[PDB]
Enzyme design. Structure first.
Site, PDB file in Angstrom:
ATOM      1  NE  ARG A 158      -7.858 -15.232   5.273  1.00 53.98           N
ATOM      2  CZ  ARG A 158      -7.071 -15.789   4.354  1.00 53.98           C
ATOM      3  NH1 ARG A 158      -6.867 -17.097   4.350  1.00 53.98           N
ATOM      4  NH2 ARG A 158      -6.490 -15.035   3.432  1.00 53.98           N
ATOM      5  N   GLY A 210      -0.718 -16.632  -0.595  1.00 50.50           N
ATOM      6  CA  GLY A 210      -1.872 -17.050  -1.398  1.00 50.50           C
ATOM      7  C   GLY A 210      -1.987 -16.399  -2.760  1.00 50.50           C
ATOM      8  CB  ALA A 265       6.501   7.656  11.664  1.00 47.33           C
ATOM      9  CG  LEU A 305      -0.271 -18.173   6.469  1.00 51.92           C
ATOM     10  CD1 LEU A 305      -1.361 -17.605   7.349  1.00 51.92           C
ATOM     11  CD2 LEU A 305      -0.272 -17.493   5.112  1.00 51.92           C
ATOM     12  CG  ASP A 347       4.367   1.358  14.944  1.00 56.57           C
ATOM     13  OD1 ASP A 347       5.250   0.837  14.231  1.00 56.57           O
ATOM     14  OD2 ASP A 347       4.162   1.009  16.127  1.00 56.57           O
ATOM     15  NE  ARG A 362      -7.147 -10.525   3.687  1.00 58.20           N
ATOM     16  CZ  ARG A 362      -6.326 -11.498   4.078  1.00 58.20           C
ATOM     17  NH1 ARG A 362      -6.242 -11.834   5.363  1.00 58.20           N
ATOM     18  NH2 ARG A 362      -5.580 -12.134   3.182  1.00 58.20           N
ATOM     19  CG  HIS A 365      -3.856 -14.017   8.684  1.00 56.76           C
ATOM     20  ND1 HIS A 365      -2.648 -14.500   8.229  1.00 56.76           N
ATOM     21  CD2 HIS A 365      -4.497 -13.522   7.600  1.00 56.76           C
ATOM     22  CE1 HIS A 365      -2.564 -14.306   6.925  1.00 56.76           C
ATOM     23  NE2 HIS A 365      -3.671 -13.711   6.520  1.00 56.76           N
ATOM     24  CG  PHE A 369      -7.782 -17.996  -2.040  1.00 56.87           C
ATOM     25  CD1 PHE A 369      -7.876 -17.267  -0.858  1.00 56.87           C
ATOM     26  CD2 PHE A 369      -6.544 -18.529  -2.398  1.00 56.87           C
ATOM     27  CE1 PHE A 369      -6.760 -17.078  -0.039  1.00 56.87           C
ATOM     28  CE2 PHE A 369      -5.422 -18.347  -1.585  1.00 56.87           C
ATOM     29  CZ  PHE A 369      -5.531 -17.620  -0.404  1.00 56.87           C
ATOM     30  CB  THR A 410       3.270  -6.918   1.363  1.00 59.58           C
ATOM     31  OG1 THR A 410       4.440  -6.569   0.617  1.00 59.58           O
ATOM     32  CG2 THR A 410       2.664  -5.668   1.958  1.00 59.58           C
ATOM     33  CE  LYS A 443       7.761  -0.869  12.473  1.00 59.75           C
ATOM     34  NZ  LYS A 443       7.158  -1.057  13.822  1.00 59.75           N
ATOM     35  CD  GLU A 465      -8.743 -19.272   3.022  1.00 62.06           C
ATOM     36  OE1 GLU A 465      -8.653 -19.227   4.267  1.00 62.06           O
ATOM     37  OE2 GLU A 465      -9.584 -18.602   2.386  1.00 62.06           O
ATOM     38  CB  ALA A 518      -0.944  -0.010   1.193  1.00 63.09           C
ATOM     39  CG  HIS A 533      -4.798 -17.932   8.048  1.00 63.51           C
ATOM     40  ND1 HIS A 533      -4.814 -17.219   6.869  1.00 63.51           N
ATOM     41  CD2 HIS A 533      -4.529 -19.215   7.708  1.00 63.51           C
ATOM     42  CE1 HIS A 533      -4.566 -18.035   5.860  1.00 63.51           C
ATOM     43  NE2 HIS A 533      -4.394 -19.253   6.341  1.00 63.51           N
ATOM     44  CD  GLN A 584      -9.284 -12.978   7.949  1.00 60.87           C
ATOM     45  OE1 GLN A 584      -8.181 -12.779   7.432  1.00 60.87           O
ATOM     46  NE2 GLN A 584     -10.411 -12.989   7.247  1.00 60.87           N
TER      47      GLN A 584
HETATM   48  C1  LIG Z   1       0.966 -11.857   7.921  1.00 60.96           C
HETATM   49  C2  LIG Z   1       0.591 -12.323   6.549  1.00 60.96           C
HETATM   50  C3  LIG Z   1      -0.288 -11.548   5.799  1.00 60.96           C
HETATM   51  C4  LIG Z   1      -0.676 -11.953   4.523  1.00 60.96           C
HETATM   52  C5  LIG Z   1      -0.172 -13.142   3.997  1.00 60.96           C
HETATM   53  C6  LIG Z   1       0.713 -13.920   4.747  1.00 60.96           C
HETATM   54  C7  LIG Z   1       1.098 -13.517   6.028  1.00 60.96           C
HETATM   55  C8  LIG Z   1       2.050 -14.365   6.823  1.00 60.96           C
HETATM   56  N1  LIG Z   1      -0.554 -13.550   2.732  1.00 60.96           N
HETATM   57  C9  LIG Z   1      -1.428 -12.785   1.982  1.00 60.96           C
HETATM   58  C10 LIG Z   1      -1.812 -13.185   0.703  1.00 60.96           C
HETATM   59  O1  LIG Z   1      -1.374 -14.229   0.234  1.00 60.96           O
HETATM   60  N2  LIG Z   1      -2.686 -12.415  -0.044  1.00 60.96           N
HETATM   61  C11 LIG Z   1      -3.190 -11.236   0.476  1.00 60.96           C
HETATM   62  O2  LIG Z   1      -3.968 -10.536  -0.175  1.00 60.96           O
HETATM   63  N3  LIG Z   1      -2.803 -10.838   1.741  1.00 60.96           N
HETATM   64  C12 LIG Z   1      -1.930 -11.599   2.504  1.00 60.96           C
HETATM   65  N4  LIG Z   1      -1.557 -11.188   3.777  1.00 60.96           N
HETATM   66  C13 LIG Z   1      -2.083  -9.893   4.333  1.00 60.96           C
HETATM   67  C14 LIG Z   1      -1.287  -8.764   3.659  1.00 60.96           C
HETATM   68  O3  LIG Z   1      -0.051  -9.268   3.187  1.00 60.96           O
HETATM   69  C15 LIG Z   1      -1.020  -7.558   4.558  1.00 60.96           C
HETATM   70  O4  LIG Z   1      -2.242  -7.007   4.991  1.00 60.96           O
HETATM   71  C16 LIG Z   1      -0.207  -6.512   3.796  1.00 60.96           C
HETATM   72  O5  LIG Z   1       1.104  -7.003   3.645  1.00 60.96           O
HETATM   73  C17 LIG Z   1      -0.139  -5.150   4.477  1.00 60.96           C
HETATM   74  O6  LIG Z   1       0.651  -4.306   3.670  1.00 60.96           O
HETATM   75  P1  LIG Z   1       0.802  -2.729   3.951  1.00 60.96           P
HETATM   76  O7  LIG Z   1       1.381  -2.047   2.734  1.00 60.96           O
HETATM   77  O8  LIG Z   1      -0.527  -2.115   4.329  1.00 60.96           O
HETATM   78  O9  LIG Z   1       1.835  -2.580   5.180  1.00 60.96           O
HETATM   79  P2  LIG Z   1       3.043  -3.595   5.508  1.00 60.96           P
HETATM   80  O10 LIG Z   1       3.312  -4.521   4.355  1.00 60.96           O
HETATM   81  O11 LIG Z   1       2.768  -4.370   6.775  1.00 60.96           O
HETATM   82  O12 LIG Z   1       4.316  -2.637   5.702  1.00 60.96           O
HETATM   83  C18 LIG Z   1       4.396  -1.761   6.800  1.00 60.96           C
HETATM   84  C19 LIG Z   1       5.376  -0.649   6.454  1.00 60.96           C
HETATM   85  O13 LIG Z   1       5.157   0.472   7.287  1.00 60.96           O
HETATM   86  C20 LIG Z   1       6.373   0.919   7.854  1.00 60.96           C
HETATM   87  N5  LIG Z   1       6.190   1.343   9.254  1.00 60.96           N
HETATM   88  C21 LIG Z   1       5.470   0.710  10.234  1.00 60.96           C
HETATM   89  N6  LIG Z   1       5.563   1.443  11.365  1.00 60.96           N
HETATM   90  C22 LIG Z   1       6.329   2.532  11.121  1.00 60.96           C
HETATM   91  C23 LIG Z   1       6.750   3.593  11.924  1.00 60.96           C
HETATM   92  N7  LIG Z   1       6.914   3.369  13.222  1.00 60.96           N
HETATM   93  N8  LIG Z   1       7.544   4.576  11.362  1.00 60.96           N
HETATM   94  C24 LIG Z   1       7.935   4.508  10.040  1.00 60.96           C
HETATM   95  N9  LIG Z   1       7.518   3.449   9.261  1.00 60.96           N
HETATM   96  C25 LIG Z   1       6.730   2.479   9.793  1.00 60.96           C
HETATM   97  C26 LIG Z   1       7.366  -0.226   7.764  1.00 60.96           C
HETATM   98  O14 LIG Z   1       8.649   0.266   7.454  1.00 60.96           O
HETATM   99  C27 LIG Z   1       6.815  -1.095   6.653  1.00 60.96           C
HETATM  100  O15 LIG Z   1       7.514  -0.849   5.462  1.00 60.96           O
END
Ligand SMILES: *Cc1cc2c(cc1C)nc1c(=O)[nH]c(=O)nc-1n2C[C@H](O)[C@H](O)[C@H](O)COP(=O)(O)OP(=O)(O)OC[C@H]1O[C@@H](n2cnc3c(N)ncnc32)[C@H](O)[C@@H]1O
Ligand SMILES: C/C=C/CC/C=C/CC/C=C/CCCCCCC(=O)OC[C@H](COP(=O)(O)OCCN)OC(=O)CCCCCCC/C=C/C/C=C/CCC
Ligand code: HEM
Ligand SMILES: O=C(Nc1ccccc1)c1ccccc1[N+](=O)[O-]
Ligand code: SF4
Ligand code: F3S
Ligand code: FES
Lengths: 613, 239, 102, 138
Positions: free
Chosen positions: A289, A54, A170, A255, A224, A400, A356, A122, A49, A41, A258, A21, A245, A243
């Site tokens: 789920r 899946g 942040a 994980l 955060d 979800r 999850h 799925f 991500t 961070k 699915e 995102a 899983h 959720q």
């Molecule tokens: C846990 C999980 C989720 C998952 C999955 C398998 C696992 C083990 N498989 C999926 C799949 O096959 N298909 C699908 O559609 N979704 C799947 N998921 C869920 C999905 O992957 C997650 O919801 C998605 O990855 C979330 O992405 P998002 O872009 O919203 O955010 P992020 O990937 O978690 O990255 C977080 C970024 O934010 C920065 N960050 C966080 N806190 C701070 C602060 N303190 N300050 C500055 N930056 C911060 C991090 O650096 C990171 O880059």
């Protein structure tokens, strides 16, 4: 406070988060011609991500002929009618266009004979508005879809002048008169603090699975951005909706996708019974789920375990062809062997329902705009955005649908970019910040750095995690939830009692993990209180005191022969949670779900019905 | 009550001329997970919280916890501890890198090299992009297998002696293998000019088939073979 | 755009298969014409061989210019010294045979 | 920020600091391939130096080759020493030759799995020992 070097930065846009995102939003803005900073961070690749397995949902119709409105229906039905159908319209309509865009960037999707993106079956998806059997619309890069998604997104993001603040924590939102002005952030590399101010701010910090003791999510998934919002006094929506899983490794909680169950996989209990036929007859072991996990949890309670404690279930891949396991799921093949010592083709995998996904988060439009609830009506927070898991446009609502999160990432990450693009022009006045603005964050930073308390961070984190795992599990009751609420509120009063050791500037992980703990607490505190407040069994939230699904009408019996319940009495509503940071009081209120789509003539509204797969 | 000893490299940049030294930690294996990261986290949480290291997924997918365990460069969440109690595990930061603090190396140059190869599709006609999906045969898809899986852990490039002696000008296995990834992606149009960017004595040609890269790769990949595949392509392509 | 680094690499492999082929060939028939081609193949492969060792270890520019010049002078002196040995003396082949029968 | 500028800012930052380089050769796991590359370099340098010493002294030092052998005859023609002197010349040559072919096979792109390195690595050592003791008898 006066011992800290402060460096002010001036930008057009700021994206907090370098996930899927975060990236799509970041370079999407730079593409529009905006001077965009991206605060993260972690290194963008390390974001959670990467761990996704899946796939990504799109009704491109590569296996059999499909239509996006059938994908729309499955999501609203999956959301248990807590999903805002305006956002679900926009997402499922963009679904084909967004996936093609990713493939055109260079995402190495698995291939058919025809040469098109390989789609898979799925959980929760159906053809012809839930009439024509199983739907095949999960686009995937073998078993490493999230990994490839993030890498090709990052890869592409190098084509623009996007200023990446890599490994920057942040702290809080730069807020003035209810309007977002930027972010104040700690630079981990040298301990310095930076004021990155921008006309528009996008929050994409992902979920907060580390509130619980057993999660699939990374150590870094600590919610955060959701915390920076609550520290600004802005509401957080549907946080009680976590959720679980169905399939996760018995050990470290890793994980098992699915996609295993969509490739002919079967879920087998203690006796050897294909039990996902005793519960769900129609969709079987490929149901929603929340339903599968409900069956899984209410199988162990019966005493039908497996190991030396008898506390888990099996996912069997003994029958599937070996060639199919290598081509379609090579990722879980290694991790089943690495973490469980299990040969996927000769043995089954020990699975457990584990935390999850967080469908709750920051309240959001279909446009990605953060909403504040004022006068019982919705209002757009100026210059503040949210997309991804951190957000809650409630495309997912109460549950979800599988493989829809990676879609959410791309669609609304892009939407956040477009909302800013067709709102103002790059070079427009960047609003001026106060010379003091952000004292509180540095004040917090300073005292947590030198925190000579009595309770070590590790122990308070574990106390919270275990308390969350015991009191707000799959099944939850008002008796246990209440003791949990008192338990979590107690642990919030321990935040000045905490002891920290590392006192350096450069790379103080001890400090940031404690900073994470503050954020984790605020997220946990809101999750637990809203759960005790909500008195129904909607989606993943399942009260045993209130086993029924409480809507405005009784939708099982015919409509219109009834008097409509007021907004005060029914539970088909969004939970908006606030917290007074000082005392940890959770004051909470509610707003109604959106039923109207973006164009009735193009996409008919799907009213509430009886829901069981 | 099984005890295992850990010898870990330590440095604090905020300690006024602090010397780089080894510090020992002793841990009960019964109250600890199987992997090295589980141990590192345990000593961070219980013994010493000044121990600074990178970690995230604990799944061997993100590539954050890359370090030198017992001689070799691997992921700490994937290499399970040697149960042999009579031995002491030696943990070091990634070989020949600037240490920021403890087991945290500077990967800034590593990432910058990855930027210089341009890891994204390049089509001659990009005016029609985003509309329809690019066609690629099932066989053309198999050619990327073994290549895309790389998580950029930097275990291989850090294990390369040529990358030690010439980190400034040589790209290393990690980046090179990725430059090859986009060479044999049937969707990429810029296959010739990608090779022409390596027409210098350092970018590619500092590889000498020492094979430490492939040997150490935690994902089981074969970068060295892919590097040998570039060398062949570099002499064969016309114009 | 000129491709010089690729041809140099291909050059290194061409002289190598020659030097490989020449060592049994020189044993098979130890003639005068073999002695010169043997001297030329040895000296080139050695020049490019050490050439790499220089570019690998010799840091900066100051020593880089000197080491590539010093190697060239050595190589020029080496090849001229071997031709002198082939022309005025018994030649590499006969020299080995004599040295071995000792 | 461009890729070239990032590298400039990497070196300016690190060299003008008190940051230490992590230990490399001091700690890294010793393997057969890595050691066999050093020996290929070792032999390469030694042999080229041997070739140069031969050509150079044939241009500077007085006397012909026939006379140069005669003075290295009258020093006790020991079977325990002359064999060893002759073995110590043919040994670096044979190693560099056998590992040289292996390099040329590699350049073609063959035998690049770890099982294929440990197998052919033994074969090179074995072919070296046999051909070096063998040619010391011709
Ligand atoms: C846990 C999980 C989720 C998952 C999955 C398998 C696992 C083990 N498989 C999926 C799949 O096959 N298909 C699908 O559609 N979704 C799947 N998921 C869920 C999905 O992957 C997650 O919801 C998605 O990855 C979330 O992405 P998002 O872009 O919203 O955010 P992020 O990937 O978690 O990255 C977080 C970024 O934010 C920065 N960050 C966080 N806190 C701070 C602060 N303190 N300050 C500055 N930056 C911060 C991090 O650096 C990171 O880059
Ligand atoms: C600069 C060169 C410096 C010379 C010193 C290096 C000596 C080592 C050479 C290794 C070859 C040993 C061969 C053993 C042998 O019996 O052949 C010699 C003889 C066999 O009896 P024969 O009467 O020919 O019998 C065979 C029947 N025709 O006669 C020949 O065959 C001569 C041909 C040999 C060519 C090899 C020269 C390669 C130089 C390597 C340089 C290494 C530098 C250290
Ligand atoms: C006839 C058998 C020989 C063959 C097949 C051969 C071939 C090779 C090969 C393939 C390499 C490594 C190139 C690379 O890094 O990929 C090499 C290195 C080298 N060789 Fe030879 N060579 C032979 C004999 C000799 C001799 C007799 C000399 C002495 C004049 C010599 C001098 C060198 C030098 C100085 C190097 C550089 C070391 C390095 O860069 O690793 N070689 N040779
Ligand atoms: O340095 C080399 N060996 C070495 C490896 C580890 C420690 C010490 C030396 C070596 C060996 C053969 C070819 C190229 C190199 N190189 O990197 O310059
Ligand atoms: S090829 Fe292997 S060792 Fe190299 S960066 Fe990728 S995963 Fe790491
Ligand atoms: S460890 Fe280095 S020398 Fe080449 S094949 Fe290897 S990159
Ligand atoms: S921490 Fe994610 S790979 Fe080891």
């Amino acid at each position: 406070s006066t011992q800290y070097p402060v460096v002010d930065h001036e930008f057009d846009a700021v994206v907090v988060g370098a996930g899927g995102a975060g990236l799509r939003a970041a370079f999407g803005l730079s593409e529009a011609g905006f001077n965009t900073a991206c605060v993260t961070k972690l290194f963008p690749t390390r974001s959670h991500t990467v761990a996704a397995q899946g796939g990504i949902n799109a009704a491109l119709g590569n296996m059999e002929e499909d239509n996006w409105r059938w994908h729309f229906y499955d999501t609203v039905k999956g959301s248990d009618w807590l999903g805002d159908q305006d956002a679900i319209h926009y997402m499922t309509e963009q679904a084909p266009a967004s996936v093609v865009e990713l493939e055109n960037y260079g995402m190495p999707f698995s291939r058919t004979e025809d040469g098109k993106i390989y789609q898979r079956a799925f959980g929760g998806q159906s053809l012809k508005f839930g009439k024509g059997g199983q739907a095949h619309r999960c686009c995937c890069v073998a078993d490493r879809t999230g990994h490839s998604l993030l890498h090709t997104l990052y890869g592409r993001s190098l084509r623009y002048d996007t200023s990446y603040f890599v490994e920057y924590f942040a702290l809080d939102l730069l807020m003035e008169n209810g309007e977002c002005r930027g972010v104040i952030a700690l630079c981990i590399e040298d301990g310095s603090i930076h004021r990155i101010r921008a006309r528009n701010t996008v929050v994409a910090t992902g979920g907060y699975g580390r509130t619980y003791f057993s999660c699939t999510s990374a150590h870094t998934s600590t919610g955060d951005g959701t915390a920076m919002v609550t520290r600004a006094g802005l509401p957080c929506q549907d946080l009680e909706f976590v959720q679980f899983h169905p399939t996760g490794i018995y050990g470290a909680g890793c994980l098992i996708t699915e996609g295993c169950r969509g490739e002919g996989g079967i879920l087998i209990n203690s006796q050897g019974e294909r039990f996902m036929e005793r519960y769900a007859p129609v969709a079987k072991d490929l149901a929603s789920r929340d339903v599968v996990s409900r069956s899984m949890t209410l199988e162990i309670r019966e005493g039908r375990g497996c190991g030396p404690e008898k506390d888990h279930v099996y996912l069997q891949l003994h029958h599937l062809p070996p060639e199919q396991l290598a081509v379609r799921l090579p990722g879980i093949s290694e991790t089943a062997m690495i973490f469980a010592g299990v040969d996927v083709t000769k043995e089954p995998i020990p699975v457990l329902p584990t935390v999850h996904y967080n469908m709750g988060g920051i309240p959001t439009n279909y446009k990605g705009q953060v909403l504040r609830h004022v006068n019982g009506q919705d209002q757009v927070v100026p210059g503040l955005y949210a997309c991804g898991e951190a957000a809650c446009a409630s495309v997912h609502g109460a549950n979800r649908l599988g493989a829809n999160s990676l879609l959410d990432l791309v669609v609304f990450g892009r939407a956040c970019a477009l909302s800013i693009a067709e709102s103002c022009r790059p070079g427009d006045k960047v609003p001026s910040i106060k010379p003091n603005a952000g004292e509180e964050s540095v004040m917090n930073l300073d005292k947590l750095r030198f925190a000579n308390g009595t309770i070590r961070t590790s122990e308070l984190r574990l106390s919270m995690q275990k308390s969350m795992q015991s009191h707000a599990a799959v099944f939850r009751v008002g008796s246990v939830l209440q003791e949990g609420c008192e338990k979590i509120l107690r642990l919030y009063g321990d935040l000045q009692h905490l002891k920290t050791f590392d006192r350096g500037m450069v790379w103080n992980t001890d400090l940031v993990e404690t900073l994470e703990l503050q954020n984790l607490m605020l997220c946990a505190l809101q999750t637990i209180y809203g759960a005790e407040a909500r008195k129904e069994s909607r989606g993943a939230h399942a009260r045993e005191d209130f086993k029924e699904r409480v809507d405005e009408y009784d939708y099982s019996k015919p409509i219109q022969g009834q008097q409509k319940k007021p907004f005060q009495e029914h539970w088909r509503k969004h939970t908006l949670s606030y917290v007074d940071v000082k005392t940890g009081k959770v004051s909470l209120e509610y707003r109604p779900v959106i039923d109207k789509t973006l164009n009735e003539a193009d996409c008919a509204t799907v009213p509430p019905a009886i829901r069981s797969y | 009550p099984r005890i295992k000893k850990f010898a870990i490299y330590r440095w604090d940049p905020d300690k006024t001329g602090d010397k780089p030294h080894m510090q020992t930690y002793e841990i009960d294996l019964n109250n600890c997970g199987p992997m090295v990261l589980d141990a590192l986290i345990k000593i961070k949480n219980e013994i010493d919280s000044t121990l600074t290291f990178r970690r995230s997924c604990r799944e061997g997918i993100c590539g954050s916890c890359a370090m030198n365990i017992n001689g070799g460069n691997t992921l700490a969440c994937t290499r399970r501890i040697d149960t042999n109690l009579d031995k002491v595990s030696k943990i070091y930061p990634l070989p020949h890198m600037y240490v920021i603090k403890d087991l945290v190396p500077d990967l800034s140059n590593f990432y910058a090299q990855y930027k210089s190869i341009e890891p994204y599709l390049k089509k001659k006609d990009e005016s029609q992009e985003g509309k329809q999906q690019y066609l690629q045969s099932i066989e053309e898809r198999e050619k990327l297998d073994g290549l895309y899986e790389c998580i950029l852990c930097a275990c291989c490039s850090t294990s390369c002696p040529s990358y030690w002696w010439n980190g400034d000008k040589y790209l290393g296995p990690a980046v090179l293998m990725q430059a090859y990834r986009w060479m044999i992606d049937s969707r990429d149009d810029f296959t010739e000019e990608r090779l022409a960017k390596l027409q210098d004595p350092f970018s590619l040609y500092r590889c000498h088939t020492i094979m430490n890269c492939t040997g150490t790769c935690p994902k089981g990949l074969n970068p060295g073979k892919a590097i040998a595949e570039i060398k062949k392509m570099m002499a064969t392509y016309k114009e | 755009s000129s491709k010089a680094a690729s041809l140099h690499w291909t050059g290194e492999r061409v002289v190598s298969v020659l030097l490989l082929g020449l060592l049994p060939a020189a044993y098979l028939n130890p003639c005068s014409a073999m002695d010169y081609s043997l001297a030329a193949a040895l000296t080139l492969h050695g020049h490019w061989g050490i050439g790499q060792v220089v570019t690998d270890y010799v840091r900066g520019d100051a020593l880089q210019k000197a080491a590539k010049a010093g190697l060239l002078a050595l190589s020029a002196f080496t090849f001229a010294g071997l031709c002198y040995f082939n022309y005025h003396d018994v030649g590499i082949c006969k020299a080995v045979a004599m040295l071995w029968k000792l | 920020t461009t890729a070239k500028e990032e590298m400039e800012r990497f070196w300016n930052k690190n060299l003008g600091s008190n940051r230490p380089l992590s230990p490399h050769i001091t700690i890294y796991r010793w393997s057969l391939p890595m050691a066999m590359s050093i020996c290929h370099r070792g032999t390469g340098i030694a042999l080229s130096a041997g070739v140069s010493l031969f050509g150079l002294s044939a241009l500077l030092l007085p006397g012909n080759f026939e006379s140069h052998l005669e003075l290295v005859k009258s020093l006790c023609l020991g079977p325990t020493l002359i064999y060893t002197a002759k073995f110590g010349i043919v040994f670096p040559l044979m190693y560099h030759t056998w590992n040289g072919i292996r390099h040329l096979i590699w350049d073609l792109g063959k035998g690049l799995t770890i099982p294929q390195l440990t197998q052919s690595g033994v074969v090179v050592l074995i072919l070296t020992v046999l051909s070096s003791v063998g040619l010391a008898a011709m």
